Design an enzyme around this catalytic site. Structure first.
Site, PDB file in Angstrom:
ATOM      1  N   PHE A  28      -8.194   5.028   3.883  1.00 45.71           N
ATOM      2  CA  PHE A  28      -7.670   4.272   5.046  1.00 45.71           C
ATOM      3  C   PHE A  28      -8.850   3.561   5.737  1.00 45.71           C
ATOM      4  CE2 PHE A  28      -4.410   7.568   4.371  1.00 45.71           C
ATOM      5  CZ  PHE A  28      -3.242   6.711   4.306  1.00 45.71           C
ATOM      6  N   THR A  35       0.819  -1.170   0.000  1.00 45.08           N
ATOM      7  CA  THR A  35       0.000   0.000   0.000  1.00 45.08           C
ATOM      8  C   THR A  35       0.881   1.259   0.000  1.00 45.08           C
ATOM      9  OG1 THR A  35      -0.097  -0.196   2.423  1.00 45.08           O
ATOM     10  CG2 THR A  35      -2.075  -1.018   1.275  1.00 45.08           C
ATOM     11  N   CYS A  37      -7.418   2.007   9.115  1.00 40.23           N
ATOM     12  CA  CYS A  37      -5.951   1.690   9.052  1.00 40.23           C
ATOM     13  C   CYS A  37      -5.305   2.222  10.379  1.00 40.23           C
ATOM     14  CB  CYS A  37      -5.342   2.410   7.837  1.00 40.23           C
ATOM     15  SG  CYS A  37      -3.573   2.065   7.739  1.00 40.23           S
TER      16      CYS A  37
HETATM   17  C1  HEM Z   1      -0.857   4.356   2.198  1.00 37.75           C
HETATM   18  C2  HEM Z   1      -0.758   3.194   2.779  1.00 37.75           C
HETATM   19  C3  HEM Z   1      -1.910   2.418   3.404  1.00 37.75           C
HETATM   20  C4  HEM Z   1      -3.171   2.290   2.994  1.00 37.75           C
HETATM   21  C5  HEM Z   1      -3.849   2.941   1.785  1.00 37.75           C
HETATM   22  C6  HEM Z   1      -3.860   1.439   3.904  1.00 37.75           C
HETATM   23  C7  HEM Z   1      -5.182   1.119   3.858  1.00 37.75           C
HETATM   24  C8  HEM Z   1      -5.867   0.392   4.791  1.00 37.75           C
HETATM   25  C9  HEM Z   1      -7.255   0.063   4.818  1.00 37.75           C
HETATM   26  C10 HEM Z   1      -8.204   0.491   3.710  1.00 37.75           C
HETATM   27  C11 HEM Z   1      -7.566  -0.636   5.889  1.00 37.75           C
HETATM   28  C12 HEM Z   1      -8.965  -1.230   6.244  1.00 37.75           C
HETATM   29  C13 HEM Z   1      -9.164  -2.623   5.640  1.00 37.75           C
HETATM   30  C14 HEM Z   1     -10.545  -3.241   5.823  1.00 37.75           C
HETATM   31  O1  HEM Z   1     -11.423  -2.567   6.249  1.00 37.75           O
HETATM   32  O2  HEM Z   1     -10.653  -4.427   5.542  1.00 37.75           O
HETATM   33  C15 HEM Z   1      -6.373  -0.856   6.609  1.00 37.75           C
HETATM   34  C16 HEM Z   1      -6.238  -1.503   7.801  1.00 37.75           C
HETATM   35  C17 HEM Z   1      -5.053  -1.718   8.475  1.00 37.75           C
HETATM   36  N1  HEM Z   1      -3.796  -1.303   8.153  1.00 37.75           N
HETATM   37 FE1  HEM Z   1      -3.375   0.083   6.573  1.00 37.75          FE
HETATM   38  N2  HEM Z   1      -2.912   1.069   4.822  1.00 37.75           N
HETATM   39  C18 HEM Z   1      -1.718   1.625   4.580  1.00 37.75           C
HETATM   40  C19 HEM Z   1      -0.561   1.485   5.337  1.00 37.75           C
HETATM   41  C20 HEM Z   1      -0.413   0.767   6.499  1.00 37.75           C
HETATM   42  C21 HEM Z   1       0.787   0.597   7.278  1.00 37.75           C
HETATM   43  C22 HEM Z   1       2.104   1.323   6.970  1.00 37.75           C
HETATM   44  C23 HEM Z   1       0.511  -0.209   8.294  1.00 37.75           C
HETATM   45  C24 HEM Z   1       1.396  -0.712   9.408  1.00 37.75           C
HETATM   46  C25 HEM Z   1       2.388  -0.012   9.859  1.00 37.75           C
HETATM   47  C26 HEM Z   1      -0.856  -0.605   8.204  1.00 37.75           C
HETATM   48  C27 HEM Z   1      -1.498  -1.475   9.056  1.00 37.75           C
HETATM   49  C28 HEM Z   1      -2.840  -1.732   9.047  1.00 37.75           C
HETATM   50  C29 HEM Z   1      -3.506  -2.528  10.015  1.00 37.75           C
HETATM   51  C30 HEM Z   1      -2.868  -3.256  11.177  1.00 37.75           C
HETATM   52  C31 HEM Z   1      -4.946  -2.516   9.665  1.00 37.75           C
HETATM   53  C32 HEM Z   1      -6.040  -3.239  10.489  1.00 37.75           C
HETATM   54  C33 HEM Z   1      -6.575  -2.316  11.618  1.00 37.75           C
HETATM   55  C34 HEM Z   1      -7.719  -2.887  12.446  1.00 37.75           C
HETATM   56  O3  HEM Z   1      -8.572  -3.456  11.818  1.00 37.75           O
HETATM   57  O4  HEM Z   1      -7.662  -2.748  13.643  1.00 37.75           O
HETATM   58  N3  HEM Z   1      -1.340  -0.034   7.075  1.00 37.75           N
HETATM   59  N4  HEM Z   1      -5.382  -0.216   5.919  1.00 37.75           N
HETATM   60  C1  LIG Z   2      -3.380  -2.118   5.168  1.00 35.99           C
HETATM   61  C2  LIG Z   2      -4.041  -2.708   3.927  1.00 35.99           C
HETATM   62  C3  LIG Z   2      -4.950  -3.723   4.207  1.00 35.99           C
HETATM   63  C4  LIG Z   2      -5.704  -4.375   3.207  1.00 35.99           C
HETATM   64  C5  LIG Z   2      -6.594  -5.366   3.577  1.00 35.99           C
HETATM   65  C6  LIG Z   2      -6.777  -5.677   4.922  1.00 35.99           C
HETATM   66  C7  LIG Z   2      -6.061  -5.014   5.907  1.00 35.99           C
HETATM   67  C8  LIG Z   2      -5.138  -4.043   5.549  1.00 35.99           C
END
Ligand code: HEM
Ligand SMILES: C=Cc1ccccc1
EC number: 1.14.14.1
Length: 455
Positions: free
Chosen positions: A393, A268, A400
């Site tokens: 996000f 991502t 996120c």
């Molecule tokens: C520009 C970069 C990123 C984008 C566009 C992005 C996007 C997203 C999105 C859309 C979700 C929700 C997924 C869902 O609802 O199924 C998500 C969840 C999450 N992301 Fe990101 N992400 C990015 C970077 C990161 C980074 C750098 C990390 C870790 C350092 C991270 C860790 C996580 C985690 C752990 C979740 C789950 C949170 C929860 O459900 O409690 N992501 N991300």
């Molecule tokens: C952070 C990107 C991502 C995409 C799908 C599920 C969880 C997280």
């Protein structure tokens, strides 16, 4: 006032399933949304979902009293190696809320001050790589951005150097991680999963889970034994207790969080930097404005945290790249109870919704007629953007957790790249968006001419 939902073409008893049997299913779904509008039903043998594309309907999908996060089939397959880490857990699992409460302070904007120095370590490695290219040479953009994001998460997250800039073949952990994600994704288009054709896939998948588990469990054990006091993501998980239950995470769940931070953040964030550079070389006036800001602000040889917060136009460039090509482009929800969506679509408890983010971000009732233009200034007055119009996000408590990390890393890196180099789209690159779990501009290449400013 019950309205009947459009549905794309069907394939007899396969329903709509064969429409996702394609190299670019999110791009195929965007075209279907252009033809059918803000909502359409999508059926496959034994399942249904409804794809949403307007701010009017997604505003309601984002109501956490009515809808919770659903694990898509892709996340169910990723769960075989990411376990009950944050992204592949259900909200109702004990380990989701415990890990969320324990990790949230480690991901805040304030926490970025403590990760900044090690993000700069990897960003200076990328800049030096490019400074050291010969005149004839070019840059493979997603590839170098991926080396950067993986190394930054490994260093800031658990004090581990993958040393991706020292390599043609990635560290074996990364090779195993990437091959496991690839097999989890390939499983979505596999008619006969028990065919002997897939015996090798099964064996190699188990081998890769073992490579990942063995390295991450060893790193956790090494840390516990040494008692070395740090403040990185691994330290916070070893030392932290959930204020609600009063319990810490166990070592197995810590391992799943570490693997999750690598998988969730690496492509991502590298996709975001790659699309942002793509849109800047395709819009030279925007590139020049962002380069003027970088030169104005980044007055020291190494950027500081404060200077990164002052890269305001670079932050708008990044938001505009996320608007057009959000690199985690869809998320799934389910109805907690029977409810009516948008005054006209009755839903039963358990019914699934899919948020098609790139189509949300092209809603002309929000953004106006010029939705396909790359214009960062449309983020100048963000208080004017209606609720739930801009969702790269995700949503609510399941949004996120890495958003501040991703944005600080991408702003710092894009800032340094614009300070140090002029860029040339030497091949007149034709955008080709490859789809895996994430999006990236496959084959994007540039030439960078150094401004010869020391580090
Ligand atoms: C520009 C970069 C990123 C984008 C566009 C992005 C996007 C997203 C999105 C859309 C979700 C929700 C997924 C869902 O609802 O199924 C998500 C969840 C999450 N992301 Fe990101 N992400 C990015 C970077 C990161 C980074 C750098 C990390 C870790 C350092 C991270 C860790 C996580 C985690 C752990 C979740 C789950 C949170 C929860 O459900 O409690 N992501 N991300
Ligand atoms: C952070 C990107 C991502 C995409 C799908 C599920 C969880 C997280």
């Amino acid at each position: 006032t019950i309205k009947e939902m459009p549905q794309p073409k069907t394939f007899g008893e396969l329903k709509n399933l064969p429409l996702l049997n394609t190299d670019k299913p999110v791009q195929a779904l965007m075209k279907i949304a252009d033809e059918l509008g803000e909502i359409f039903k999508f059926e496959a043998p034994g399942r249904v979902t409804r794809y949403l594309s307007s701010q009017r309907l997604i505003k309601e999908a984002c109501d956490e009293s009515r809808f919770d996060k659903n694990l898509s089939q892709a996340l169910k397959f990723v769960r075989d190696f990411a376990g009950d880490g944050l992204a592949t857990s259900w909200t109702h699992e004990k380990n989701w809320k415990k890990a969320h409460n324990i990790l949230l302070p480690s991901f805040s904007q304030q926490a970025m001050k403590g990760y900044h120095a090690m993000m700069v370590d990897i960003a200076v490695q990328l800049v030096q790589k490019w400074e050291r290219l010969n005149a004839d040479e070019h840059i493979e953009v997603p590839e170098d951005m991926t080396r950067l994001t993986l190394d930054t998460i490994g260093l800031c997250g658990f004090n581990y150097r993958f040393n991706s800039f020292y390599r043609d073949q990635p560290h074996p952990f990364i090779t195993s991680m990437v091959r496991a994600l690839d097999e989890a994704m390939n499983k979505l288009q596999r008619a006969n999963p028990d065919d002997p054709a897939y015996d090798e896939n099964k064996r190699q998948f188990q081998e890769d889970i073992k490579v990942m588990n063995d390295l991450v469990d060893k790193i956790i054990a090494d840390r516990k034994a040494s008692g070395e006091q740090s403040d990185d993501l691994l330290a916070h998980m070893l030392n932290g207790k959930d204020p609600e239950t009063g319990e810490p995470l166990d070592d197995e769940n810590i391992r799943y969080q570490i693997i999750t931070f690598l998988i969730a953040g690496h492509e991502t964030t590298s996709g975001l930097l790659s699309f942002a550079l793509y849109f800047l070389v395709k819009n030279p006036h925007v590139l020049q404005k962002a380069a003027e800001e970088a030169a104005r602000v980044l007055v020291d040889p190494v950027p500081s945290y404060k200077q990164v917060k002052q890269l305001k136009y670079v932050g708008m460039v990044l938001n505009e790249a996320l608007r057009l090509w959000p690199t985690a482009p869809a998320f799934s929800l389910y109805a907690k109870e029977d409810t009516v969506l948008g005054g006209e679509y009755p839903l039963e408890k358990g019914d699934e919704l899919m948020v098609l983010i790139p189509q949300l971000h092209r809603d002309k009732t929000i953004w106006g007629d010029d939705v396909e233009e790359f214009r960062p200034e449309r983020f100048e007055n963000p208080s004017a953007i209606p609720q739930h119009a801009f969702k790269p996000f995700g949503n609510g408590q399941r949004a996120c957790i890495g958003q501040q990390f991703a944005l600080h890393e991408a702003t710092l890196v894009l800032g340094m790249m614009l300070k140090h180099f002029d860029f040339e789209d030497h091949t007149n690159y034709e955008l080709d968006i490859k789809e895996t779990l994430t999006l990236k501009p496959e084959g994007f290449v540039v030439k960078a001419k150094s401004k010869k400013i020391p580090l």
